[PDB]
Amino acid sequence: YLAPLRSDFTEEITAPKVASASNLVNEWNN
Amino acid sequence: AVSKKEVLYFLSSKDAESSTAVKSYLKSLYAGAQVEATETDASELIAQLEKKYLSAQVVEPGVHNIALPLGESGSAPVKRYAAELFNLGAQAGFECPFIEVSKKFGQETATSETVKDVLNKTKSYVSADYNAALNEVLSSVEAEINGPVLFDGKTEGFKKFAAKAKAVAVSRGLPADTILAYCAGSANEDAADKVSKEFFTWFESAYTADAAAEVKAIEAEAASILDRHLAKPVAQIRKEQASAYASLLKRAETAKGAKWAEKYLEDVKAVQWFDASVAEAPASGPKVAA
Amino acid sequence: CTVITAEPLDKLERVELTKKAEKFVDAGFKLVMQEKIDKKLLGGFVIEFSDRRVDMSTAKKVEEFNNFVNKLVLSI
Amino acid sequence: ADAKALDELRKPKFSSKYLIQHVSQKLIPAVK
Amino acid sequence: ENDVPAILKEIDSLVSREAVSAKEVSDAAVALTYLQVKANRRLWGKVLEKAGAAQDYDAASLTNLLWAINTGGVEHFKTVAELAGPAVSLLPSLSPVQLSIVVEALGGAGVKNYELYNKASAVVVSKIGEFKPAEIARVLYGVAFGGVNDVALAKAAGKVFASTEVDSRTAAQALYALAKLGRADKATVDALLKSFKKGTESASDAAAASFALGSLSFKAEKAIVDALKASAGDLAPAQAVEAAYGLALSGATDAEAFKALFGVVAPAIEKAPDALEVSSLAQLHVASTISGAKLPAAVGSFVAKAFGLAADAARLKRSSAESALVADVAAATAVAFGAQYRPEVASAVASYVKTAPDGSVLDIAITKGDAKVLVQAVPSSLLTSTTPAKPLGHVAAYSKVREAQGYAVAVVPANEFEALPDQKAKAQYVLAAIKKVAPSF
Amino acid sequence: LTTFTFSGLQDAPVAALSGSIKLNVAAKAGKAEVTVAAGAAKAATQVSAAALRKLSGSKISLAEVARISVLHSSIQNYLLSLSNERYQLLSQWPDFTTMYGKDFYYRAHPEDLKKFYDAADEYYKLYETVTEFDSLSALASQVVPNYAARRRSTVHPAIGSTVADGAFTNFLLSKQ
Question: Terminus of chain D with fewer CB atoms < 10 Å: N or C?
Answer without folding.
Answer: N
